Design a protein around this nucleic acid. Structure first.
Lengths: 101, 61, 89, 54
RNA sequence: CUUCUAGUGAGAAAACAACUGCCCGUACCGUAAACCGACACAGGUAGUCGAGGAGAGUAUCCUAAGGUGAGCGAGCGAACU
RNA sequence: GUAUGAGUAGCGAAAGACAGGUGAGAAUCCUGUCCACCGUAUGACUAAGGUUUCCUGGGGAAGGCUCGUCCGCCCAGGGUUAGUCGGGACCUAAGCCGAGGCCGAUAGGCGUAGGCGAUGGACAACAGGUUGAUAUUCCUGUACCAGUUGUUUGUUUGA
RNA sequence: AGCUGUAAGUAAGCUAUGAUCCAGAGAUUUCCGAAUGGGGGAACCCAAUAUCUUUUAUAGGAUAUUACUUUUCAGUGAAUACAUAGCUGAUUAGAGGUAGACGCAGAGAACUGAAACAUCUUAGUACCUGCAGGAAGAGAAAGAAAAUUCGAUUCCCUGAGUAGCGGCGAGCGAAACGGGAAGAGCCCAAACCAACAAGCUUGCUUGUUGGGGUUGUAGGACUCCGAUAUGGUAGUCUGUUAGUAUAGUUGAAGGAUUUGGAAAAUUCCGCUAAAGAGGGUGAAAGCCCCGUAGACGAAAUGCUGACAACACCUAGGAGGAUCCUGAGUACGGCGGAACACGAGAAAUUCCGUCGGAAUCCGCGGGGACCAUCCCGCAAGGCUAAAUACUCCCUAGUGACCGAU
């Protein structure tokens, strides 16, 4: 999906613009992604098997995948991603000076 | 896992078919009386039987 | 085919009382005989059988979510023994 | 009386026409008679046209 | 079913014992609120059983065994139907 | 889709009353007592037909011509047991189908041998007990019908 | 790199030793149904014969085979002797459905128009039945014409609402010439000559196989010499490659600012284009995501070309003694129909019924009929393309709809 489940990522659009975080889960075929600490939401649960005291709880919500950008692990600036011919495990070979991501 | 079923003979084939059919009988009796923690083993046995039967068809032309 | 014939036991309140007179209830295959069931039970447990009895059960109209249709058909056989026992739990 | 064995003459349709040119439907038939012939040894009673016996 | 022959055609009669015997239906309503009448409808629905007194009787009135109080009520006690 | 007629006609034959229960709530549900109705039927059993409406535990939004704590309604589980009863592995009636056959623009119509087809023929088990729901089917006692195994003379035919 | 459909919910699991997912080829495939062992109220019931199984045994389970017709071959076979009906067995093919379409046949209306209604129209339309094919049907002159001709069939333009037909009313309605799309031609019968069998006329009559031979400028047989080579195919589940359909790969270029919950909007300053088609993203994006222009790819199976083999087919000149060239046929009377042509002065083409030729010194046609001239050679078979239709699969399009 051009973004994987273990991955550091920066946010382009939507109220968390400029935040970073490690990807938490990938949902292909709906093209969304959960990022750590990024789209916090407040629910209201009644007691059930998990947390028999259901308070007002807060977890992340999935954002759309094109609101996101990969970060080169070694250098730290967000990059568009391209594919090139290494010994034939084709990996995302970063733009912005041809390094492996 | 046909790579092992192809390491045997057509007599031990029919033998393991007997064994797996009997396992299915016993699993089916567990599931009804309130046992069988691991319910994913019923599908696995069905599919191992299917594999033996295809491999036996292939080899006898 | 002697090992696809018996499907499973029946465990209801009317069937617990039968286990105290040496009777056992199984859902058996449709297209099975009194005699075929008897052979299968004598083969799979090493008992001696007096008298299979056999019934058919009609399907039931059900209706969940504005979609209605019937459950399966069923075959129930009750097996009586001379002297031996099978332990199901 | 359905066809003949050697030709194919069968029945068809025609018109009557009655002096004021009214037309109704009608049947036309061939002149078939039952005869014994030697078609491959054993005699057979078949319908044959009189024009093919002529 | 019972006889008579024609008939491929070792030697089966009857004692005890113990064994074998398949498939389909089987609930419940059924002079009815469960069937036919669009209805929880004063209509229709084959057959068997169907008690006592008084009586020729399965008529008539009152009852036995059994069943039932019927799915809108409380008042008033005019005209009229 | 909504008015008017209008809170009007009607609420589909018939005897109830009181005490006490349950409940948020009772003329209408439960239990009792007395009263009243049918009784060649409004009682008991069964063939069609229906097809789960049958039993147990919960429910009260709609259905029920009022009400409802109730129900042939709604949700969850459960119930139908046969050598001998009724049907097949037996017989045939009316009628139907019909190898060959005979007829006929086509399609097809008829019909022989031989079959299907009960409303009729033939054909071996009874009395009692038991469940919340099945009983000539389960159980008890005592039977009967058709077979199978074992232990108790020339296929000419007088076996 | 995640996954166990809709489908939430939970429980158990699978996957970097490559899941899930995608394309080609396989395997399995209950029961009913043409339904085909016999029956039947479709999805059920009941068998026969062999082999195998459960049981001490009977009862029980499995697998194969078993309809009808035709068309080929053996066995058996008879009213009736020889043998033909028949019967048993082995072999060969059919049978049913549809794409509510397109084609060719059989049979075949009515309301309606004529301001009524019979001829006529609606109309050989609708409906029904048979047979198909991927297209069908027609097709290689017994033709179109009129001097100076042209050469198989089909389809389009035009001729033309003409020439005609018609209670001469309502109305029906051509063709050839001229211009185009596409183009292609072939095989038998007969005479005669051999091999075989029967009639052994031991005359050569009946036949079976092979050869020869296919036409109007008449052609062939037959006799005479030449040649014994050369032009082609509408052919095969034969090889050699080339492409192609069915999965995919890669694919340029943006940040800050203002208003908002959120910008793709506003304002600044940049970049990219063989790519400014389209869709998505918290509002309107060439530069965020999927794509697009361009470049690349197939283990397997199926299609279409090309060139190879293999299979088939194809010769001149002369002669004019004799033989051949499709018979109950062409044609005629009677009754019907088809031709735009309603019996008309009615040629041409069919069907039923009866009568019934000629043989190259011949036979048919040029719209009754005759004479003369001109053009053809029936009564045997096949054939691509140019034209019709869309149940379905792929890729798209619309001054077409937008929940009565």
């Amino acid at each position: 999906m051009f973004v994987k489940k273990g991955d550091k990522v920066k946010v382009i659009t939507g109220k968390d613009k400029n935040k970073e975080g490690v990807v938490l889960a990938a949902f292909p075929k709906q093209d969304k992604v959960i990022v750590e600490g990024v789209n916090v939401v407040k629910k209201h649960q009644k007691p059930n098997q998990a947390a028999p005291q259901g308070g007002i709880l807060e977890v992340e919500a999935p954002i759309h995948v094109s609101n996101v950008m990969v970060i080169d692990p070694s250098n730290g600036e967000a990059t568009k991603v391209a594919f090139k011919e290494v010994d034939g495990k084709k990996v995302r070979v970063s733009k912005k000076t041809g390094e492996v991501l | 896992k046909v790579k092992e079923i192809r390491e045997l003979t057509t007599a031990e084939m029919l033998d393991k078919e007997k064994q797996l059919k009997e396992e299915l009988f016993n699993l089916r009796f567990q599931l009804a009386t309130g046992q069988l923690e691991n319910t994913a083993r019923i599908k696995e046995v069905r599919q191992s039987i299917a594999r033996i039967k295809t491999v036996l068809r292939e080899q006898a032309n | 085919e002697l090992l696809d014939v018996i499907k499973r036991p029946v465990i209801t309140e009317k069937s617990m009382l039968a286990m105290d007179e040496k009777k056992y209830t199984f859902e058996v295959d449709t297209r099975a005989n009194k005699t075929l069931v008897k052979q299968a039970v004598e083969s799979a447990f090493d008992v001696k059988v007096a008298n299979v009895n056999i019934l058919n059960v009609r399907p039931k109209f059900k209706r969940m979510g504005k979609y209605a249709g019937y459950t399966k058909k069923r075959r129930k056989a009750i097996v009586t023994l001379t002297e031996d026992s099978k332990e199901i739990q | 009386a359905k066809v003949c064995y050697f030709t194919g003459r069968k029945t068809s349709s025609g018109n009557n026409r009655s002096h004021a040119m009214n037309s109704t439907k009608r049947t036309v038939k061939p002149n078939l008679q039952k005869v014994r012939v030697l078609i491959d040894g054993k005699p057979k009673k078949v319908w044959v046209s009189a024009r093919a016996l002529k």
